[PDB]
Amino acid sequence: TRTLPPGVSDERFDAALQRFRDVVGDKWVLSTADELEAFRDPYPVGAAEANLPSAVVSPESTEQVQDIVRIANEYGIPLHPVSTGKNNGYGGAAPRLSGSVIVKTGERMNRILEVNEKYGYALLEPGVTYFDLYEYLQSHDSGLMLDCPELGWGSVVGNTLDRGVGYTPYGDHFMWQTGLEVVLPQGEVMRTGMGALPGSDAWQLFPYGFGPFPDGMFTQSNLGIVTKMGIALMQRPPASQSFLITFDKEEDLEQIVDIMLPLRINMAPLQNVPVLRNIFMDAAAVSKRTEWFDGDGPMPAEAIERMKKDLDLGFWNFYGTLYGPPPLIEMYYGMIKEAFGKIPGARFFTHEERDDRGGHVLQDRHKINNGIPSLDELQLLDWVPNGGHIGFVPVSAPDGREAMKQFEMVRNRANEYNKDYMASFIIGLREMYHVCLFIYDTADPEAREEILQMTKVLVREAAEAGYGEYRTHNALMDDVMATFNWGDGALLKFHEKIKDALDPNGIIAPGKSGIWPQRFRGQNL
Amino acid sequence: RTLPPGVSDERFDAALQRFRDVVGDKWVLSTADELEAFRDPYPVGAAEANLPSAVVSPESTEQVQDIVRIANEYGIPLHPVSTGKNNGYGGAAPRLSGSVIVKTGERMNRILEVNEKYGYALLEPGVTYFDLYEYLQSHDSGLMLDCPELGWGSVVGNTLDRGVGYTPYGDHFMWQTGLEVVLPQGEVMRTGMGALPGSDAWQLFPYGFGPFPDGMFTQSNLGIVTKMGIALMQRPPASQSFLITFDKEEDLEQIVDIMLPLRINMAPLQNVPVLRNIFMDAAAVSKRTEWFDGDGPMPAEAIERMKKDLDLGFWNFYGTLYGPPPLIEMYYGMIKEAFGKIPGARFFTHEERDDRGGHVLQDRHKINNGIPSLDELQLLDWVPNGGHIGFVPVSAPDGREAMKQFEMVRNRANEYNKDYMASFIIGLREMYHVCLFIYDTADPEAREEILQMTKVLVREAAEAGYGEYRTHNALMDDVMATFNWGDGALLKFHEKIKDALDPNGIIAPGKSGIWPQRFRGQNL
Ligand SMILES: *Cc1cc2c(cc1C)nc1c(=O)[nH]c(=O)nc-1n2C[C@H](O)[C@H](O)[C@H](O)COP(=O)(O)OP(=O)(O)OC[C@H]1O[C@@H](n2cnc3c(N)ncnc32)[C@H](O)[C@@H]1O
Ligand SMILES: *Cc1cc2c(cc1C)nc1c(=O)[nH]c(=O)nc-1n2C[C@H](O)[C@H](O)[C@H](O)COP(=O)(O)OP(=O)(O)OC[C@H]1O[C@@H](n2cnc3c(N)ncnc32)[C@H](O)[C@@H]1O
Ligand SMILES: C=CCc1ccc(O)c(OC)c1
Ligand SMILES: C=CCc1ccc(O)c(OC)c1
Ligand SMILES: [Ca+2]
Ligand SMILES: [Ca+2]
């Protein structure tokens, strides 16, 4: 029947719902099954129901977020704060803890508070999407560009608060995060950095302020509800060129990664975040699985060759963008061609050179890499009927043999659980991300369970090989946090200890990143 | 005899022996003669302050655990340092008098790893910039380090006070990647991929999984750091350092305003731009008495003599470029066209000045190329028994803000009879007004003048909306008090976390104005 917060009666919840309505207004509290359906994980993981929200409250202001937090303390209601709630791949808007109330900050707190052309920064509310901020910069003939992930409909703030990434030189969103406002778990409000000094202009200029630097503690965290966040914005460069390098062989991965890293570690000639996508990923962006293979089980070699041939793509496809005066772009492109040119079968294409279906991903990278938000990459989910995805992203050293081992290890398990291997190898400066998107039929309970059991295996095996996940789904946060158990889980004990100090009543997103406040510890949900 | 607060002669003597049982008899100092060397070398205020009770030098992480556990038992406050060279901010001296200094760097001074492939170091606290430079030279490294002005500090300890250098990797804390820390009750923790047993990425990926804590251990008293990683930048094929002299006090406005556009895209100004006033560059190469032996502020005549003799401006801009010679030349050309629009602007590369005035340029050419130096110690010869205090408000990188800040500080410096040694430094979007006040450390009134002058500068800067990035023991309470948005919400947040991790209030009480429960309200 009715989803309730843990240890909270029908009466007590009805009372708390009304207190919420007194703060934000009747139409900004959802609690009917019909109203809540939209806030369930759109890509559900596992056959069983999980991650069930009891209600959605949409606050209009920081003060309203304080009031909601104080009520949640009164009634012991757990709050799952989101911005836009588009964390698709990691649970969407759905709370880790079933019965939690979703605080959708972004519905009404969606205002651009400042875009400074002189100093190159924005001060944003959670509700500001990449499309909102893009449209604002266009409107105002801005000299600035934003840094967006593959999908423009997410929150600049929300994405930053899960340490999301884009593909411009400003792709590490949390680095460029500068100052935030946060409602702490008992309702008091705090500004970090120069925000903490009344009348400073430097909130979005100097990240650290004075004393311990806390902003990090509010990312992949449950230590408060963020109401404002500053972010630095790069100046748009005078020109840019996007290029695709197709690599013919599965085994080329080793040489590609080993040539990638020297070209990237000095942020030149690879100026942007280098992404290497397998043919599955690029095929899924432009085609249905059944275009290639309507059989059961893993995709055969003949089918993969047909994908490569028809799309004129390799097994591994490298995407990069260069920025600056055309001479500098041409110099950097020349270096890139010489270095990756030593791999037999490497073929090169600029964004101007491919208008065919195989080229559509390059055209999308040319947008995303230039801070032009897109939703083209939603086409991935038409690979199979009713397509959803889960993100599996272990962090690796950027070595060719280390990539090769991860390639084998994950494709092998993928095959066993009848899921295709959609994978990208991405490099920051000195780290490698194995970005695996498993696409499955969300309507099929067996496919959902296969995904939950497969990724549980993939997490454990990756950790046995010394690979930690940078980010994970609601279903895997306990399993993943368990892997960071150096010194008898010293890290988790440190986090719990702080969680209990700031959230004595255990209100804020209990179980986020495997961090449960005292009142829930040992209870298996 | 200096004792910890609320600890008897007999309890302390017991505790000193327990320390000896852990680290050895030789590695516990507690005589007045032994402790002299660990007093603030640039003392602030007339009165005695910042008195250590003992110095304990541990050999290992395990020993640090044992010391912290003993400290918890006896309620002894511990001030963890690396090398203890935080000169201008108290040196090795503890904020709280009676604290035991834990000099981690004395014996924990080992380079644990330098990775040529991935460009990083994993370091203990005692590794100095000289130590790590020597290592890189020895091993024919492709890598360069990022050092502050003085090479004798700790790579780790400087990072833990969010210190800065002048290469593209000038933000030390940014490039910090992984640490190991002994938390205030003696348990040991590794951050990031350090927390995943057998990961290779401790020094490759900073964040790891869940909340990002590393920042909480910088300008902090939440533990004793025993290892720290840091990224090292590949040495580029060539570099060129350059000096722009600017003739006029009033040029500051246009310098800062041309400086920001050339810096924010990290090109053409590829390194940290530093603008030094003639006082700064003169004190680097000469004594005060060479220019003016009279009492009180230095007259216009004397300033003009400094400029002529050293062939420098009132404001001197020092930068470095890196890469292929064609790139360096292109960038230098853009810099010359931009700053050239200021009348009286003159340009010199490091190759074009072998005179005394050029000595600072030569020292920057070293520092900006990750070659540690001690040349800038000559600043302390400006007056007899020279010491300095660091006063560094953070500002918008705006000409008129720089100009306001220049007047505001020089006026108060004048009033308290201290010379105005100042640099304007710029990261990407922020500006540091770095003011070194050089004074006679043997003169109790010069000491009191410094304390009272900087107290005034701190609240006057705060009234103008400027916060300090970093400050001295004597000012930490005053400085933290200025960050009082939402009724001092930030300090309240820091205090709850301090009390959660340090229930006995052991680790560096009062660091950054953060006192644990047992000390709050006691005025030391
Ligand atoms: C399916 C998919 C997903 C995807 C992607 C490609 C595909 C095909 N590419 C991505 C990429 O390139 N980079 C990236 O970082 N993510 C990518 N994803 C995943 C996802 O689409 C995006 O990351 C998305 O932008 C994230 O969702 P959103 O931006 O809406 O953020 P949120 O869901 O509202 O909040 C995220 C989490 O952070 C915490 N949170 C959020 N807001 C707050 C506030 N105000 N206070 C406290 N905590 C907050 C919550 O834990 C929330 O779940
Ligand atoms: C006088 C002076 C000072 C100076 C400078 C120029 C002059 C003329 N130029 C500097 C510069 O360009 N950049 C910079 O960051 N600092 C500069 N200074 C100040 C100072 O000399 C240096 O910053 C110096 O590197 C700091 O000294 P050191 O490196 O020895 O650091 P420390 O005293 O040992 O530690 C600093 C503080 O951090 C905490 N700490 C240190 N180690 C630990 C450990 N292991 N665990 C926990 N906390 C630790 C303490 O609070 C300590 O006081
Ligand atoms: C090809 C990149 C897609 C992608 C990148 C980073 C992510 O975190 C992600 O989450 C599911 C998806
Ligand atoms: C002339 C630059 C010296 C300098 C720079 C940054 C600092 O923090 C500092 O501390 C006292 C001194
Ligand atoms: Ca072939
Ligand atoms: Ca032992």
Residue numbers in the entry:
A (entry chain A): 2 to 526
B (entry chain C): 3 to 526
Authors' account:
In this work, we engineer EUGO, a VAO-type oxidase, to catalyze the selective dehydrogenation of 4-n-propylguaiacol to isoeugenol. Similar to VAO, EUGO is active on various 4-substituted phenols and contains a covalently bound FAD. The oxidation of 4-alkylphenols starts with a hydride transfer from the Cα atom of the substrate to the N5 of the flavin cofactor. Consequently, a p-quinone methide is formed and stabilized in the active site. This reactive intermediate can subsequently be hydroxylated by the base-catalyzed attack of water, or tautomerise to the dehydrogenation product.
Interestingly, this additional mutation (D151E) resulted in a similar conversion compared to the parent mutant and similar steady-state kinetic parameters, but it displayed exquisite chemoselectivity by producing insignificant amounts of the undesired products. This prompted us to create the combined mutant D151E/S394V/Q425S-EUGO5X. As a result, the less constricted and tightly packed environment around the Cα atom of the substrate reduces the formation of the covalent adduct that impairs catalysis. The engineered D151E/S394V/Q425S-EUGO5X mutant was named 4-n-propylguaiacol oxidase (PROGO). The crystal structure of the D151E/S394V/Q425S-EUGO5X in a complex with 4-n-propylguaiacol was solved at 2.4 Å resolution. It showed that the bulkier E151 sidechain points towards the propenyl Cα atom of the substrate, potentially sequestering the reactive quinone methide and obstructing attack of water. The Q425S mutation renders the environment on top of the substrate less packed, creating a looser niche around the substrate side chain. This allows the 4-n-propylguaiacol to rotate slightly away from the flavin N5 as the substrate side chain can partly occupy the space vacated by removing the Q425 carboxamide group. Gratifyingly, this eightfold EUGO mutant was found to display all desired properties: conversion of 4-n-propylguaiacol led to the rapid formation of isoeugenol as the main product (97%). Characterization of the purified enzyme revealed that the kcat had improved by two orders of magnitude relative to wild-type EUGO, whilst retaining the thermostability of EUGO5X mutant. By introducing two more mutations (D151E and Q425S), a variant was created that combined all desired features (stability, selectivity and activity), acting as an efficient 4-n-propylguaiacol oxidase (PROGO).
